[PDB]
Amino acid sequence: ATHSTHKLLNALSQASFIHVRNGRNAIDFNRFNQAYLMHSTTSPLYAICASNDIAADMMDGNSGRSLTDEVIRESIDFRQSLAYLYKEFLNDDEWFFKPWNQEMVKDPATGKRYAFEDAPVELLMREQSCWVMHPEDKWHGFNDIPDNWAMLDPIKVSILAPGMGDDGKLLDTGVPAALVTAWLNHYGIV
Amino acid sequence: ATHSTHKLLNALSQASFIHVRNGRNAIDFNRFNQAYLMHSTTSPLYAICASNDIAADMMDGNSGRSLTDEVIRESIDFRQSLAYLYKEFLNDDEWFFKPWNQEMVKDPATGKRYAFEDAPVELLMREQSCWVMHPEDKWHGFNDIPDNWAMLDPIKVSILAPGMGDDGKLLDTGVPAALVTAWLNHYGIV
Known part of the structure; x- marks a missing residue:
């Protein structure tokens, strides 16, 4: 496993880790060290x-649990607020952006169903099945995916501009994401 | 103009009024009294x-203004509550009954648009255009009606069971109103 510690952990650029779990046909330290030196520098900073x-x-x-919890909760708050605004604008027959996640989530304990924006935050933070890609759901759009195969990372939040139909073909009207990206860049968000 | 005073005013059954505004080819009292006696009884109760x-x-x-205001406000409260519940169930991808009125209302003063269930009660109680059948609206379904021709009486509240498409053809599923009527009769509502 390779981690870029600077990407989604707290480290300076170029910091990285190699993690090894020895199993079949493992590479011992003397052999691995040759490749390690081959792609390193003799004067590390x-x-x-x-x-x-x-x-x-x-x-x-x-601390790791606490920090991941904080990030996940922030992303969930953003997703639920965006879904709520999308529903509000839809009720006023207007367009808006929607988060790319499950529309409806099920509580596995009590069996109760919620709209995503109405689901309790504790349920979304605790239950993995609220993020699993189920083949019967239309939100993810990966047709013929097996169940309990993939899962959505809450902290990588995708928003969808209107214009794409659920069948795979464009609608009569929409807002292309390039223009929204230009707007966000103008306001500094990249 | 003929009023059945027992229908939507406060009078005993068989009470009625004939109202006359004399214009062209008017019928004077001596001539009208013959027809009046012809369809009356010599011993009225x-x-x-x-x-x-x-x-x-x-x-x-x-008192007339106050009483009509009370009835209209009650009917508006029912309509808005039913529309809100319909939107809630629709958001949970479930079916429910919806009131038969405008989906969106426009404030003629400020130009602001509201969903019917979100419109201020004062606006619905005061503005006639919130109840006029406009040709551009799909709720009433009277195609090719001229504008400012007809209007919906708020206190005659129609509710729609699901099953009828906006185009005029049935949907894949629905709830027929005969069964709901049987339910209401079972609970005494006729």
């Missing part, structure tokens, strides 16, 4: 390694 | 005439 070390420490113990 | 008199008195002055 120790600030990068220090950032790797502090990132690992930051995920250690209770 | 004075309780019926007394109920007619009290109904007329009840509509006199401020």
Whole structure:
């Protein structure tokens, strides 16, 4: 497993990890070290390694759970607010952006169904099945996907501009995402 | 103009009024009295005439406005609550009954548009155009009706069971109104 510690953990650019779990046909340290040296430098900048070390420490113990919880909760708040606004504008027969997630979520304990924007935040934060891609759902659009195969990461939030039909063909009207991207770039969001 | 005072005013059954506004080719009292006697009885029950008199008195002055206001407000509260429940069930991808009125209403003063269930009650109670059948609206279904020709009486509340498409053809599923009528009769509502 390779982690870019600078991407979604807290580390400086170029910091990375190689993680190995030894199994069949494992590579011992003496053999692996040759490749490691082949793609490294003889004068590493120790600030990068220090950032790797502090990132690992930051995920250690209770703090990793707490930090991932905070990010997931922020993303869920954004998704639910956007879904609510989308429903409001739809009720006023207007267009808006919608988050790319499940429309309806089911509570596996009580069997109760909720609209995504009405689901309790604890349920969305706790239950994995609220994010699994089910073959019977139309939101993800991956036809013939097996159940319990893939899952949506809550913190990578995709929003959909109107214009694409559920069947795969364009609607009569829509807003292309290139123009929205130009707007966001103008306001600094990339 | 003929009013059945027992229907939507406060009078005993068989109480009625004939109202005349004399214009071209008017019928004077001596001539009209012959027809009046021809369809009357020589021994009227004075309780019926007394109920007619009290109904007329009840509509006199401020009280007629106040009583019509109360009935109209009750009907509007019912319509808005039913529309709200319909939207809620639709958001949960379920069926429900919907009131037969405008989906969207426009405030003629400020130009602001509202969904019917979100419109201020004062606006619906005050503005006639919130009830006029406009040719561009799909709710009433009277194709090629001229504008400012007809209007919906708020206190005659029609509810629609699902099953009829906006084009005029049935949907794939629905709930026929005969069964709902049997249910209501079972609970005493006729």
